[PDB]
Amino acid sequence: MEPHDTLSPAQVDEYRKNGFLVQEHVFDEEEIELLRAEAAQEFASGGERVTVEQNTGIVRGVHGCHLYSEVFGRLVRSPRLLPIARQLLRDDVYVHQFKINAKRAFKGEVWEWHQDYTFWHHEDGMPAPRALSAAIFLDEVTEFNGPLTFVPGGHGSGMIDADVKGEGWANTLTASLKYSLDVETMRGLIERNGMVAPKGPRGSVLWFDANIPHSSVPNISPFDRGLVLITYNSVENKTDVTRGTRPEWLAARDFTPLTALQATSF
Numbered sequence: 001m002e003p004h005d006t007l008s009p010a011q012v013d014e015y016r017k018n019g020f021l022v023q024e025h026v027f028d029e030e031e032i033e034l035l036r037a038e039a040a041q042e043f044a045s046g047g048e049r050v051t052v053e054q055n056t057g058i059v060r061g062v063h064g065c066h067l068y069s070e071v072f073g074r075l076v077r078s079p080r081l082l083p084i085a086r087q088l089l090r091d092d093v094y095v096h097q098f099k100i101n102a103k104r105a106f107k108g109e110v111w112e113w114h115q116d117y118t119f120w121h122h123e124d125g126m127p128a129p130r131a132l133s134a135a136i137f138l139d140e141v142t143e144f145n146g147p148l149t150f151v152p153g154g155h156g157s158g159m160i161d162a163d164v165k166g167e168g169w170a171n172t173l174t175a176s177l178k179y180s181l182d183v184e185t186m187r188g189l190i191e192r193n194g195m196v197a198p199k200g201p202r203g204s205v206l207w208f209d210a211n212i213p214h215s216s217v218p219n220i221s222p223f224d225r226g227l228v229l230i231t232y233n234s235v236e237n238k239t240d241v242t243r244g245t246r247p248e249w250l251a252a253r254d255f256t257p258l259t260a261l262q263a264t265s266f
């Protein structure tokens with residue numbers, strides 16, 4: 001393997017200030033094709049772990065793949081990913097959540113403004129927002145294929161009071177989100193901080209804070225927007241399983257600290 005990757009001090013500062021950071025071209029075309037093929041397999045065989053877009057039935061997401069797929073199990077331990085998660089969370093880490101979110105060409109939904117941590121705190125018993133997500137770009141992310149859109153520095157407020165809607169956890173994965181940020185709060189945020197939709201080539205990784213507000217629009221391009229999202233959590237920040245409400249394929253219960261893939265002959 002290559003000497004474990006880490007972010008420069010400038011990159012770390014940028015991540016801390018803005019709440020997100022893109023590394024371009026982390027994975028090459030052949031690597032991304034391997035991940036795309038495995039994603040397709042998970043969409044086909046994932047069963048109850050799969051979600052479909054309402055009004056289309058097109059497969060939208062699949063969850064918990066690193067528990068069921070050897071490829072994705074290895075991916076979360078990649079020397080391209082694990083060392084940076086450790087660096088940013090300043091701890092050993094484990095995977096809280098794994099999901100693949102596809103927005104096909106000419107498809108896609110408006111994803112309501114939200115903070116991930118609100119879900120993890122209330123649904124899963126995550127005590128603090130000492131977690132982040134790595135979004136691997138299976139496709140080039142552009143202005144026009146429904147990029148994750150953020151309020152830069154919007155995580156600095158911490159967790160924001162949100163409109164709650166629905167019972168259970170069914171609507172934690174849907175177009176209509178259980179925890180959504182209202183018109184008023186978002187106006188103030190954006191007036192103060194603005195909006196940014198990070199772009200990048202296929203194989204890029206977008207790191208973003210558990211508490212950063214984000215949203216996305218439909219894909220009006222003729223090109224898909226597949227993302228593999230790995231949520232790393234600090235081991236010290238392990239969720240309180242006694243307040244947990246969701247299956248392990250949404251919220252992990254094995255808090256064993258991850259170690260990196262080492263090079264083998266097979």
Ligand SMILES: O=C(O)[C@@H]1C[C@@H](O)CN1
Pocket residue numbers: 097115116119120172173
């Ligand atoms: O419910 C969850 O855990 C994730 C967090 C947000 O991305 C929305 N769905």
